PDB file of C-alpha atoms and ligand atoms in Angstrom:
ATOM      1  CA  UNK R   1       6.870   9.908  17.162  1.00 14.63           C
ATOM      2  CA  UNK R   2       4.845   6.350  16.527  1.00 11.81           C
ATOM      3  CA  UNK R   3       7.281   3.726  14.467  1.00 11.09           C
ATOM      4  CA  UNK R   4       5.144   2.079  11.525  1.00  7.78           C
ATOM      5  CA  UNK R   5       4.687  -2.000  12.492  1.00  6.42           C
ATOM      6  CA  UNK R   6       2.510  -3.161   9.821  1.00  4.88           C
ATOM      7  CA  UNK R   7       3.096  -1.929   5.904  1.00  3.47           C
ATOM      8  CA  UNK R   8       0.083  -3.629   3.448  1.00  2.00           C
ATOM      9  CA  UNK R   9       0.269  -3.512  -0.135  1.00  2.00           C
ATOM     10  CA  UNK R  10      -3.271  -4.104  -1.752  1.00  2.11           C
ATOM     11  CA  UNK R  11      -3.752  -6.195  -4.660  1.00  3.73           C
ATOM     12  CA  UNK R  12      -6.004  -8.581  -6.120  1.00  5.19           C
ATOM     13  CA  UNK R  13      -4.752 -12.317  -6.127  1.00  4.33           C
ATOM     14  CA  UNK R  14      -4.251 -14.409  -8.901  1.00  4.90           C
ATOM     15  CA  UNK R  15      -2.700 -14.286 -12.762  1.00  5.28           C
ATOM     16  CA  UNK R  16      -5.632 -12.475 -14.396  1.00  4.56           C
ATOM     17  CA  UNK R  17      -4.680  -9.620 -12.055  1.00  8.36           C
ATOM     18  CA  UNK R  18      -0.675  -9.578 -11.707  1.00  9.40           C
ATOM     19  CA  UNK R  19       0.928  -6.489 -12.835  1.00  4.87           C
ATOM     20  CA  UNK R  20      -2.740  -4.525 -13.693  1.00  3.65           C
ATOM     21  CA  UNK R  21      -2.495  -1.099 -12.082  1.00  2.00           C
ATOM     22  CA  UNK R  22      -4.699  -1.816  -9.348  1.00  2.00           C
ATOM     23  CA  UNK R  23      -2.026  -3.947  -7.622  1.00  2.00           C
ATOM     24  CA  UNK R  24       0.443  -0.854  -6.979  1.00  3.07           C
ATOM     25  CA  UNK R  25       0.865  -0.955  -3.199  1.00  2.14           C
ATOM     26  CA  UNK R  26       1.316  -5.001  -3.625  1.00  3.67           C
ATOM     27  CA  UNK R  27       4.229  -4.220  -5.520  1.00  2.93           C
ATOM     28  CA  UNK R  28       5.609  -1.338  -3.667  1.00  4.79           C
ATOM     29  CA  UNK R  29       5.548  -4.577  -0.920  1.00  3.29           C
ATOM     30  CA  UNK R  30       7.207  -6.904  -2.888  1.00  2.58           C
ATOM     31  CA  UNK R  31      10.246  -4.628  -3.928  1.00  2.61           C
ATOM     32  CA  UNK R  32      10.264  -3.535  -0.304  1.00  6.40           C
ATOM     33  CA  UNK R  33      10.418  -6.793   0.629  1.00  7.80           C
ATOM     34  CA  UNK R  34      13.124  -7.931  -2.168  1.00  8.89           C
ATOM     35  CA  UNK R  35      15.093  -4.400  -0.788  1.00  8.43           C
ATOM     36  CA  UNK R  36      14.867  -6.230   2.525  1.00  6.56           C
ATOM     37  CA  UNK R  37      15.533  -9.687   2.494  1.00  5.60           C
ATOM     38  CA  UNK R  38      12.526 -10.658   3.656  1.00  7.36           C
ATOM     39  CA  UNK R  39      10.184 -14.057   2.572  1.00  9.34           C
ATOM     40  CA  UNK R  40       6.791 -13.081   2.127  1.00 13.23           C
ATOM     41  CA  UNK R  41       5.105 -16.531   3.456  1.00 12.89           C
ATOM     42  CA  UNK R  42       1.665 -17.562   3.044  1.00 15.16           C
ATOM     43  CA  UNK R  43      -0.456 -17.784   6.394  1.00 12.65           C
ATOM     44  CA  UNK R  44      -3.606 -18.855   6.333  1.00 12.84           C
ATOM     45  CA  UNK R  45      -4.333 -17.506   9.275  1.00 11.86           C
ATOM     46  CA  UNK R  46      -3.910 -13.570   7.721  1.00 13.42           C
ATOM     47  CA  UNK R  47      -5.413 -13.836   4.705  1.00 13.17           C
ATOM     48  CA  UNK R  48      -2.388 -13.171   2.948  1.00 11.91           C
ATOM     49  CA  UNK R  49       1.172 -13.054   2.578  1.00 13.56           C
ATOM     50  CA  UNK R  50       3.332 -12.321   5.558  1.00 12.88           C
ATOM     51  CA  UNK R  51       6.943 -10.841   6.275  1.00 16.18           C
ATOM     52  CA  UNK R  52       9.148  -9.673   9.017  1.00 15.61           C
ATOM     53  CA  UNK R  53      12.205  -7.760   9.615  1.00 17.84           C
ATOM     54  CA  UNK R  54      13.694  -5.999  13.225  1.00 15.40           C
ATOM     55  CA  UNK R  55      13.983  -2.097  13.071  1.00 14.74           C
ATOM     56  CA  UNK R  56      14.971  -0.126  16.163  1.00 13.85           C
ATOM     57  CA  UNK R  57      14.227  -3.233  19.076  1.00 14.78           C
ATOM     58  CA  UNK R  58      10.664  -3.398  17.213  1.00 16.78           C
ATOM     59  CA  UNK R  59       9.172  -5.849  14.654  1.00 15.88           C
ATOM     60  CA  UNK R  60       8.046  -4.628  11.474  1.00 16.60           C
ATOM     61  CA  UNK R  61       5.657  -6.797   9.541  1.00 19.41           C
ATOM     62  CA  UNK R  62       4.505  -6.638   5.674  1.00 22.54           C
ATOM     63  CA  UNK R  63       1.314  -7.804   4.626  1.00 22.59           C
ATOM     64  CA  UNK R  64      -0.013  -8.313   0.668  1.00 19.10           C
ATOM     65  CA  UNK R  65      -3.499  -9.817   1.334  1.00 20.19           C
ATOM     66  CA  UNK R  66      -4.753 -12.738  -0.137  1.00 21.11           C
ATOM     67  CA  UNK R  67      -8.763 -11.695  -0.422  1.00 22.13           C
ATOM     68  CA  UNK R  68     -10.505  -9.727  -3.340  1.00 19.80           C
ATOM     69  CA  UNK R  69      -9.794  -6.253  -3.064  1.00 20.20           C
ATOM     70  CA  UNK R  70     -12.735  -5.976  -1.587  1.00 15.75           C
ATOM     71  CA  UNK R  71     -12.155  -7.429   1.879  1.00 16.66           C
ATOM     72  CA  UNK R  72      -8.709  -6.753   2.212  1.00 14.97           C
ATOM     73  CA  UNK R  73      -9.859  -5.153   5.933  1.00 18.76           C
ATOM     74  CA  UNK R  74     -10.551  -9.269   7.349  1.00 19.12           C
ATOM     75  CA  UNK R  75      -6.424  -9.452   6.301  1.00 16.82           C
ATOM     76  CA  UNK R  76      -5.559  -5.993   7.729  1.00 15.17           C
ATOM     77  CA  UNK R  77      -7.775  -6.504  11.215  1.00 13.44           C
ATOM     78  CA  UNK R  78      -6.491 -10.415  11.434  1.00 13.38           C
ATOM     79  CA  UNK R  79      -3.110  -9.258  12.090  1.00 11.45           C
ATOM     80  CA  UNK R  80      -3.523  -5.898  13.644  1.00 10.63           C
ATOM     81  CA  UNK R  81      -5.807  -7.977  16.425  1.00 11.57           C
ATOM     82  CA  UNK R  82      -3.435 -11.185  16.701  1.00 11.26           C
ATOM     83  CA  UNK R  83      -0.436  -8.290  17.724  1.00 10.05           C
ATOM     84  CA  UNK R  84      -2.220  -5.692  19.007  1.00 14.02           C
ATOM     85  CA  UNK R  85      -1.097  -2.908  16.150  1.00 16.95           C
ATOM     86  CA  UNK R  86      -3.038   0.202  16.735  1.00 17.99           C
ATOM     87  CA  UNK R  87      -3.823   2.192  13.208  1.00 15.65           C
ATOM     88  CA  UNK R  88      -1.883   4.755  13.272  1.00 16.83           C
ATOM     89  CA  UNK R  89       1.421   2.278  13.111  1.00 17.41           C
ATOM     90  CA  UNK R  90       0.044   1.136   9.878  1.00 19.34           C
ATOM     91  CA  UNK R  91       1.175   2.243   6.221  1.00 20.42           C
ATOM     92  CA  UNK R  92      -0.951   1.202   3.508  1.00 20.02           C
ATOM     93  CA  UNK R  93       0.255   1.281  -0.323  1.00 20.78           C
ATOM     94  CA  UNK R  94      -2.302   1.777  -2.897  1.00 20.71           C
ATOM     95  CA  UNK R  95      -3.369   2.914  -5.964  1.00 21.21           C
ATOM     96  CA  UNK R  96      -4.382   6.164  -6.740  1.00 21.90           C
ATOM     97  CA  UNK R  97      -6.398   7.905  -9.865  1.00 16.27           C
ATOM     98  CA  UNK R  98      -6.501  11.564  -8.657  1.00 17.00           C
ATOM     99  CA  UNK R  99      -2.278  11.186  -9.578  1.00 18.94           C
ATOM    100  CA  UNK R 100      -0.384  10.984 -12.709  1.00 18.90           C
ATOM    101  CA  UNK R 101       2.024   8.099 -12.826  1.00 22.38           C
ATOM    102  CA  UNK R 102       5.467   8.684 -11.688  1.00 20.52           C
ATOM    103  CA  UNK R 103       3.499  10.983  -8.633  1.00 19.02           C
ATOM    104  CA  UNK R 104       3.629   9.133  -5.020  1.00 20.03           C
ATOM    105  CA  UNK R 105       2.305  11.129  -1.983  1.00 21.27           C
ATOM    106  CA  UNK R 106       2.382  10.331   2.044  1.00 22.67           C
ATOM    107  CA  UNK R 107      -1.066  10.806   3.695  1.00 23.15           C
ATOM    108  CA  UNK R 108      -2.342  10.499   7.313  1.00 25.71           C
ATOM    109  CA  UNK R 109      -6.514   9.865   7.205  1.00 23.38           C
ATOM    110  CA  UNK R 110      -9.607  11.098   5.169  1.00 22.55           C
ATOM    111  CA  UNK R 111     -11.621   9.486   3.094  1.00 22.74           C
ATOM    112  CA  UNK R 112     -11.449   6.380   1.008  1.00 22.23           C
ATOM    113  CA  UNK R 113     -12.031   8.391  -1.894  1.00 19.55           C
ATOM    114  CA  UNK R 114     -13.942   5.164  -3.702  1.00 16.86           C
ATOM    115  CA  UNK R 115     -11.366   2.767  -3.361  1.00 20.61           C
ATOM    116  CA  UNK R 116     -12.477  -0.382  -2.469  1.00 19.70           C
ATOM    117  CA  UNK R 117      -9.708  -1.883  -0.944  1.00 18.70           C
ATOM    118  CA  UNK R 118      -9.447   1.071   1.642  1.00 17.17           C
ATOM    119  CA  UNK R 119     -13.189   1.335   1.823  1.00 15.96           C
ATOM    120  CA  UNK R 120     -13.292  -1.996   3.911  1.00 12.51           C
ATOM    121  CA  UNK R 121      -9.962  -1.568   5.966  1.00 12.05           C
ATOM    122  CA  UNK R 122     -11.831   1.621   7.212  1.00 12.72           C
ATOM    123  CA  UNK R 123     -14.653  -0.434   7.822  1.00 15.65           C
ATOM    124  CA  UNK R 124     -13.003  -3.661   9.446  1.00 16.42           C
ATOM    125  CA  UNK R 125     -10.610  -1.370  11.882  1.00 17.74           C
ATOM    126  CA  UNK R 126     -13.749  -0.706  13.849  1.00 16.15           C
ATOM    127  CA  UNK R 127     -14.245   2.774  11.530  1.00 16.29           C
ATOM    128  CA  UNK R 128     -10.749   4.156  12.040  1.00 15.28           C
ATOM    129  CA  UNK R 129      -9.409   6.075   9.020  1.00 16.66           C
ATOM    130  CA  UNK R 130      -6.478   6.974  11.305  1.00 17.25           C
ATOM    131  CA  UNK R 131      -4.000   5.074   9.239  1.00 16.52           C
ATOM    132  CA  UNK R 132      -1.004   6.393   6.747  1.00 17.08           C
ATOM    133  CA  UNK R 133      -1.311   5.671   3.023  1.00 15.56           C
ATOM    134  CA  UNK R 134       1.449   5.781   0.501  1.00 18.26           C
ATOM    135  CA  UNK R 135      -0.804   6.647  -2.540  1.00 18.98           C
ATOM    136  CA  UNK R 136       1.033   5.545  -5.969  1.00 21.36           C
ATOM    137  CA  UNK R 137      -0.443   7.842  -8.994  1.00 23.37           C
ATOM    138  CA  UNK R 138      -1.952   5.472 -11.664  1.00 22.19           C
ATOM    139  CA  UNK R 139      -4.080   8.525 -13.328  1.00 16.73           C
ATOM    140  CA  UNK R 140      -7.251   8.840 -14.032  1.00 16.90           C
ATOM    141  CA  UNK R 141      -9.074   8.097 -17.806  1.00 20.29           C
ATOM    142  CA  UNK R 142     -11.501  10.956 -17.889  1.00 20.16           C
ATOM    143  CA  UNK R 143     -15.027   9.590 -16.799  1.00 23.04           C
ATOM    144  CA  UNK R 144     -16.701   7.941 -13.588  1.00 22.08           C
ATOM    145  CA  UNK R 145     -17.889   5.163 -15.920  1.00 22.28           C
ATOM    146  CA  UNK R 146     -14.464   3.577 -16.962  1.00 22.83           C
ATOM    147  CA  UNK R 147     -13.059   3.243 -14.004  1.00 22.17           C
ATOM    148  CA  UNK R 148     -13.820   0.182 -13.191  1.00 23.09           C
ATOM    149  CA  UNK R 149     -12.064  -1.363 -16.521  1.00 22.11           C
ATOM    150  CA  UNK R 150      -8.947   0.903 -16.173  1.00 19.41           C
ATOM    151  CA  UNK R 151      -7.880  -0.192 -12.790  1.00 18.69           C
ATOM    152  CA  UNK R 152      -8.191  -3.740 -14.155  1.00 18.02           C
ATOM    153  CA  UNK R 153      -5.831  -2.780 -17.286  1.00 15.78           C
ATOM    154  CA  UNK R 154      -2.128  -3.355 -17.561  1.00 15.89           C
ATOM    155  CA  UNK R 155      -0.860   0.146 -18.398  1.00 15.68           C
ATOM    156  CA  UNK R 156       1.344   0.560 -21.332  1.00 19.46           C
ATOM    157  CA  UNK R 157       5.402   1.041 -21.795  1.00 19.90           C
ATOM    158  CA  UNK R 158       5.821   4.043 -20.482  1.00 19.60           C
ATOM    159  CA  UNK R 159       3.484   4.395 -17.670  1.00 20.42           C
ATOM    160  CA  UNK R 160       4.754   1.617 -15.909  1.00 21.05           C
ATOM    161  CA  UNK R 161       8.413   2.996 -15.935  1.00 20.02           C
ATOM    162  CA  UNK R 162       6.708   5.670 -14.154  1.00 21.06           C
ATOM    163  CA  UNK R 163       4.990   3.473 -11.415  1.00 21.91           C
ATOM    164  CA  UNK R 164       8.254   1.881 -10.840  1.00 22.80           C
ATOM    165  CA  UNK R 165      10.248   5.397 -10.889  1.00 22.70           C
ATOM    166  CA  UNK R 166       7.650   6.579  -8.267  1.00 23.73           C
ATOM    167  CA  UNK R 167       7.651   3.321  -5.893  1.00 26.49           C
ATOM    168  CA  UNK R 168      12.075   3.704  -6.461  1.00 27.28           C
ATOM    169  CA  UNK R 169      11.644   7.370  -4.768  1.00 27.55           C
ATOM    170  CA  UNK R 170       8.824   6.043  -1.999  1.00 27.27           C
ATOM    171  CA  UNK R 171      11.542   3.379  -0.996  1.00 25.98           C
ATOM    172  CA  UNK R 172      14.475   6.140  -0.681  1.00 25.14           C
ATOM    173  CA  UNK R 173      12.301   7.269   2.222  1.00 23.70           C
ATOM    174  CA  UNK R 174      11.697   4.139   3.839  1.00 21.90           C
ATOM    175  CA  UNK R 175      14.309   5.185   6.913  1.00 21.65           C
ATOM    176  CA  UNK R 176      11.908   8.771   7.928  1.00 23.24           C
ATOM    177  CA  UNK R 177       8.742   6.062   7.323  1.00 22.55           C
ATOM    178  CA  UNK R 178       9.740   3.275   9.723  1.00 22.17           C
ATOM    179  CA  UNK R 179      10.646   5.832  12.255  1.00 21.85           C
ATOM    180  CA  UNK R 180       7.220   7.701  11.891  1.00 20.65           C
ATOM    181  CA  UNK R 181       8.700  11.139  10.593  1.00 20.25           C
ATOM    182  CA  UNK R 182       5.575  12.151   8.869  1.00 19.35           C
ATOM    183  CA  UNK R 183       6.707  15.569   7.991  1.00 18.97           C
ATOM    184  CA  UNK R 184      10.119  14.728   6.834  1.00 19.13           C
ATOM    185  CA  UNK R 185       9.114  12.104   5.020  1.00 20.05           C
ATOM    186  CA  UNK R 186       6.493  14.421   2.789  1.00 21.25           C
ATOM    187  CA  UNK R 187       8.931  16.954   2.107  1.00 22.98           C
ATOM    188  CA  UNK R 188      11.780  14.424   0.478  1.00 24.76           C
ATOM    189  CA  UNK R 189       8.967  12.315  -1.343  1.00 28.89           C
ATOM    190  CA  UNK R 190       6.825  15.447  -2.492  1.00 25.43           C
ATOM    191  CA  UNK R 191       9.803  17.386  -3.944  1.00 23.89           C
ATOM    192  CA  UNK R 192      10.644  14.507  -6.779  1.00 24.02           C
ATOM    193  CA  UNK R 193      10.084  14.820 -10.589  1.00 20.94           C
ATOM    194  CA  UNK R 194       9.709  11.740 -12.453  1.00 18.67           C
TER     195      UNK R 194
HETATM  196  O1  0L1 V 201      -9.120   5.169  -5.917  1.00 18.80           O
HETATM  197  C1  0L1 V 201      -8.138   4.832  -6.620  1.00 18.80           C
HETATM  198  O2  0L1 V 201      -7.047   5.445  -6.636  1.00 18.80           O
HETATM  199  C2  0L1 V 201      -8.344   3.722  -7.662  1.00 18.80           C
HETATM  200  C3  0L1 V 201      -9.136   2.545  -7.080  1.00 18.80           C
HETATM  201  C4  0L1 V 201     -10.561   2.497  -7.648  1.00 18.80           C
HETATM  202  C5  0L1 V 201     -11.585   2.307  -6.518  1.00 18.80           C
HETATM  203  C6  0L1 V 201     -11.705   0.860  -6.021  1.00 18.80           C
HETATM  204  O3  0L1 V 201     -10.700   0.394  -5.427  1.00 18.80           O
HETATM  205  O4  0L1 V 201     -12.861   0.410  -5.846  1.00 18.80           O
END
């Protein structure tokens, strides 16, 4: 019943981080974008890079911020505030370890579950985990302590055909997504094999 307004993609900025596997939901945004026809322009004013496209009378912007990782929730609440966009007409992409790649799941709230990136957009919506997250399966490699340096990796051959076969099946629902179809968008995405 509530229409998603505001899609972000997190990412770190800059060449030393394109294509590692911690910039997932930036690139589910870009091919969403390129799917689109839509210019992702840089404004200053949102900490990132911004797009636009109509969808039902209503406007539907994208957002890939421009900050660290870290304090991708100043980019998130800049634009949320400037047009009133309450969180739960917000769909965030992102990374996620507790999924193998080729794995991409729809979930509404919880926990931040040690990401960063969603640790501060929790924090900068005035504490509202009320939001949607299209989590991307990057897998996991085994212990607490490596995390860190696999995130910042470029995954092999065959693990990013599986990203990019999971973010493919995430955009076949974009139609039950934009509309807010929670429920029928889960049971398409959730019932793919990569
Ligand atoms: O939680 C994940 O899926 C991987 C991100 C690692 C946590 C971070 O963003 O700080």
């Amino acid at each position: 019943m509530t229409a998603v307004q505001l899609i972000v993609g997190l990412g770190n900025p800059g060449p030393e981080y394109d294509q590692t596997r911690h910039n997932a939901g930036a690139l589910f945004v870009e091919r969403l974008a390129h799917a689109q026809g839509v210019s992702l322009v840089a404004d200053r004013k949102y900490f990132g890079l911004v797009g636009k496209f109509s969808h039902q009378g209503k406007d539907v912007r994208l957002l890939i911020p421009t900050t660290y990782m870290n304090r991708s929730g100043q980019s998130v609440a800049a634009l949320a505030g400037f047009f009133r966009i309450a969180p739960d007409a917000i769909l965030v992409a992102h990374d996620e370890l507790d999924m193998p790649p080729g794995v991409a799941k729809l979930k509404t709230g919880g926990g931040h579950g040690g990401h960063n990136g969603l640790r501060d957009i929790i924090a900068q919506l005035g504490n509202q985990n009320s939001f949607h997250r299209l989590r991307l399966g990057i897998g996991h490699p085994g212990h607490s302590s490596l995390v860190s340096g696999y995130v910042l990796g470029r995954a092999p051959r065959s693990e990013q055909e599986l990203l990019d076969t999971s973010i493919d099946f995430a955009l076949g629902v974009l139609p039950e997504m934009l509309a807010g179809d929670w429920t029928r968008a889960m049971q398409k995405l959730h019932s793919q094999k990569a």
